[PDB]
Structures are given as C-alpha cells and as structure tokens.
Design a protein around this ligand. Structure first.
Ligand SMILES: CC(C)=CCC/C(C)=C/CC/C(C)=C(\F)COP(=O)(O)OP(=O)(O)O
Ligand SMILES: CC(C)=CCC/C(C)=C/CC/C(C)=C(\F)COP(=O)(O)OP(=O)(O)O
Ligand SMILES: [Mg+2]
Lengths: 297, 294
C-alpha cells in the first residue's frame, strides 16, 4: 500500500495542455515511425505533453509547445534505447547531437533526425540566446542515458548526494527557465544551489518510489528504494513509504530555504519565479508518477 | 511537540506493579548504601520496579520480582560506574561475576556484593535451569557497561546493524524469557532471529528519538539520518518514527509467516507477543524517563 502522505505543495497544470497536447501528439502521429496502431493508441494514452504541462505550468504560452516536443521526442528515444546495446544506443544519440546544434542537416526520410533538427531550429528562431543555453544540458542528459558508471559501495547518504547532481533534473530546471523566458545569471543561480540540490533529490526519490517495479523487472539496481530496504531491513514497499515521508521533509526544507533567500535579501524577482517553478516540478512529478501507466498504475 | 505516528501496539504494565515495587524498593532502601536522604528520594522516584513492569507485563506473578531486583541493582551500578574510570569500573563489575555465579562468597560488609550474591542464589532456588541460562546475558551486559566505543564513519545501515546486536536489548529479551518461564530450544531461538533483530532496532531507534536532546548536550540514528538526508534532527526524528512503525508491521508479518509455516510453537507465540509489549513499553518509557530529561 502506497497512500501519499500529506503535502503542502499543490501541483498546477498549464491551461493550454489540451490544445498543445493534440497539436504535439498530432505532429508525432504524422511523422514518427509507429509500428502498429496499437502503438499510435498507446502513444496518445501516454500523454507526454501532459507531464510537460505539470512540470512547467507557468511556461509562457508561445513556448510550452517547445518543451512538450522536446520531452516527447526524448521519451520516445528512451523507449528505443531500451532495445539497444550501449554502443548502439550511444551511437544513436551521438548522431543526433550535431543535428541538434544545427551543424549537420537531417536525412528528411529519418523522422528522429528531421524532428530533432526542425525542433531546435524552431527554438533558435524564437529565442536564439536561450535556446543555445539549453543545448549542453540536453546533451549531458542524452549522453548520460548511455552511461557506464563506476560500481562502488554506496549507502543511502552517498546515493542521495549523488542524486542532488542528477543531470536529468538539471535538464528540467534548464528547460523550465527556457519555457518561462527566465534569464538568470550564474551569480543568481549560485544563490540557490541548496534549493536546486534538494529539488533534484525530491524528484529522483519520487521517481524511484514509483518506477521501482519497472526497473526491478527490466533488471531481471541503483535506487533509493532498494538501498533503504537493505539498510533498514524492510520490504521495498515499506521503504517506499519511509522515503515518501523523507520527501515531505524535503518539501518543508524547500520552503525554509526559500524563506531564508528572501530573509537574507538575496531574492530577486527572477529567483522568486524560479524557486516557485521548482516546487511545481516536484509536485507535478508526483502526480504524474503515481498516475502514469509508464510505471504501470 | 513531536507526535508519534499511529500504532497498532499499546503499552501495558504488570498487574502486580504496586506490590512488587514496594517489595523491591524496600529491599534496596534497607541494604543499598545511599549517601544522603536525597538519594533515597531520587531512587524511589526513578521507580526501577515500575520500569521493569512496563517492559515485562506478561511476566509470571512469582517471577516478576526477580526481574525488578536484577534491573534495579543493574541501574544502581550503572549510575555508580558514571563516577568511575574504565579500568576501575571494569574491575568493579568483574568482581561481581564469580559472585553472581555463586563461586565466590560475598563480602557481607559490601552491600552490592551480597545483594548480587543473594539474588542469584534465590533465582537458582526458584528455577536452576532458567537462572543459569541468563547468567551469560547478564555478564555480557555488565562487561559492556565499561567497554570503549570506537568512532568511525557510519551510515544508517551500519548503525542499525550495530544496534541489532545491542547487548542491553539482548539482556531484556533473555530476562523476559526467564520472567515468563519460557524455555526455548536452540531451534526455536534460531527461528526468531529476524524477529529479534527487528525488535532490537525498534527499541534502539525509539530510545534515540527521545534521548537526542540529552545526548546533544554523537552515535545515534537521529544525527546519522539527518546528515545522510540533509534535514534537521527534528525532521530525522519524524522519519525514523515512521521507520519504527514499519518495523512493527514487519514484526506482525514475520510472526504471521512463522505461524503460516508450521513453525510457531506455544513458547514462541508467548515470546513474540512479549517482544511486542517490550516495543510499546519502551516507547512509553522513552517518552517519560528522567534519564533523557533536560
Ligand atoms: C526522456 C525521460 C524519462 C526523461 C528526461 C526527463 C525527466 C527527467 C523527466 C523527469 C522525470 C523522469 C522520468 C526521470 F527523471 C527519470 O526516471 P528514470 O531515469 O529512472 O527513467 P524512468 O524512471 O522513466 O524509468
Ligand atoms: C540496566 C541498563 C542501564 C541497561 C540494561 C537494561 C535495559 C536495556 C533497560 C532498558 C531501558 C533503557 C535504560 C534504555 F532503553 C536505555 O538504553 P541505554 O542504557 O543504552 O541508554 P544509554 O546507556 O545509552 O544512555
Ligand atoms: Mg526510475
């Protein structure tokens, strides 16, 4: 049993979600290579633009569609790397990087290539500087998909510390800034490093809780659920419950950290918007993770 | 404030708590060499027999007093050792072991020596077999009252595994069996290893939760989890309290499995319920003992 404990974070959903979802789903159904119509149907049921709209509820109205397209293609690729080597998968993504920079033109007969090319081209055409700024965060993530990670002894504290620097979570934060047109200086971002880390941990542990069965089966792992279960000698289900409570403590910490930024006179209007958006990512990720069929509801 | 989360367990006290407490308190007031009157007031206030009855509420009526006398002298010695060096403390207790065994006569002029001597003689008189079986558990504990703890980097898992082997909790379980007249075979004890480990952690973490402020005046689950999760000690206490409730669920699940499999004997059934009350009793004790105060 997994009844989420009480939370003071209320998730928000972008008002254009219905409009942008059919637009973006419509686009991929027209160009992406879907095998059977069971796939087409399963794709629309996945609601990739829906998650995006829970992650970035305050994205600017003419920018939410870029984020939806980027995460939709990234999720589609994710499904694909699953049935690929390490070498196959690394080769696959790698080709897409120069295409993303616009340095290499796409083969108009390969959907993934032209979809990626046109997407980035459209982002540069809307806001060149901000689009270029999310290039590396996206590539860091893409390359990280196909890792190859040094195995070593890692307890709960080492694991959480590690997730504070998760590149997938840094990507969401970067894409959030682009989507909201939030130009923040590294000086301003310096000021909220603890809030970013705490947020990265919350997102990773909530994903751990809900994707445990998924990962476990495909494993037949490095996740807070298995680690806490082993350290406390309880079942994975019991470990999820305990981690959920820890997630609420990080929600409280987020609030205390935000109040300190403000109290120390370090907040700026851009930082106030940024930290509030991080909160939406944490609560939105929770709602989605517990309802999506991706982790088999 | 710190509100304990919901629990299906509840504290319970031995029915004879009033009579036994008077009987055992009087014995010590008569023999134990308390410095001043104040000491006698503090001693009666600590109510070691009442603590004992909260931990072993299902003890047999004619055996609960042996448990109150043993923990009482052990509590008194604990305090004294506080005013002694490692070496002296070790010699002090080491002198009492042959005496507990009945191998060496006590110096009738030194109360702690004859009190210990007589208590063990009397237990052996009530149930030789069972009295002899709790000898080593008491000595392991007595020798631990003075051993040196080495500091080393320790995560939550390492800490919990260390607490699973806590000699104090081991003592409690062995004395509970003696007090309840439960003679378990090696096969029965082997069968409940996981249940014992789970209970030992529960007792230890609950103690941690409530002893933290006092300790923060080092080696505790409250500080370790707060550092590992990067939250405050109060937050860590809240998370650990929920972990404790999970251990209670686990205790119930493990006992059900024991029974499911044809392995729960009448002795083990009494024993695992006994541990349930040690967990609920320890929680109440932790919440109210002056040992953790200010
Ligand atoms: C294209 C995808 C999934 C993610 C890029 C964007 C992200 C970070 C969205 C946030 C949520 C997400 C599912 C993870 F962080 C990763 O989960 P994990 O790494 O454990 O994979 P799964 O949990 O989905 O199995
Ligand atoms: C007779 C004594 C003192 C111990 C053996 C008998 C026991 C375990 C009685 C139980 C209740 C108690 C004193 C605690 F739970 C404290 O454990 P703990 O004693 O570890 O608290 P600290 O000694 O760490 O301050
Ligand atoms: Mg996952």
């Amino acid at each position: 049993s997994l009844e989420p404990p009480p939370s003071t974070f209320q998730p928000l959903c972008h008002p254009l979600v219905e409009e942008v979802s059919k637009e973006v789903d419509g686009y991929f159904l027209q160009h992406w290579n879907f095998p059977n119509e069971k796939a087409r149907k399963k794709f629309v049921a996945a609601g990739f633009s829906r998650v995006t709209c829970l992650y970035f509820p305050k994205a600017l109205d003419d920018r939410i569609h870029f984020a939806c397209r980027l995460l939709t293609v990234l999720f589609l690729i994710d499904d694909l790397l699953e049935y690929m080597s390490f070498e196959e998968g690394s080769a696959y993504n790698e080709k897409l990087i120069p295409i993303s920079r616009g340095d290499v033109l796409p083969d108009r007969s390969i959907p993934v290539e032209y979809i990626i090319y046109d997407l980035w081209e459209s982002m540069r055409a809307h806001d060149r500087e901000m689009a270029d700024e999310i290039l590396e965060p996206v590539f860091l993530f893409m390359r990280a998909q196909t890792d190859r990670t040094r195995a070593r002894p890692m307890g709960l504290g080492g694991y959480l510390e590690y997730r504070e620097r998760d590149v997938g979570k840094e990507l969401l934060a970067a894409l959030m800034r682009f989507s909201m047109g939030l130009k923040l200086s590294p000086s301003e971002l310096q000021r909220v490093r603890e809030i970013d880390a705490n947020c990265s941990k919350h997102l990773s542990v909530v994903n751990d809780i809900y994707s445990y069965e998924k990962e476990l089966y495909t494993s037949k792992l490095c996740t807070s659920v298995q680690i806490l279960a082993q350290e406390a000698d309880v079942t994975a289900e019991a470990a999820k419950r305990v981690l959920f409570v820890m997630c609420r403590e990080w929600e409280l910490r987020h609030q205390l950290l935000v109040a300190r930024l403000s109290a120390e006179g370090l907040e700026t209007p851009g930082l106030a918007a940024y930290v509030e958006g991080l909160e939406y990512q944490m609560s939105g990720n929770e709602l989605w993770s517990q309802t999506t069929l991706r982790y088999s509801v």
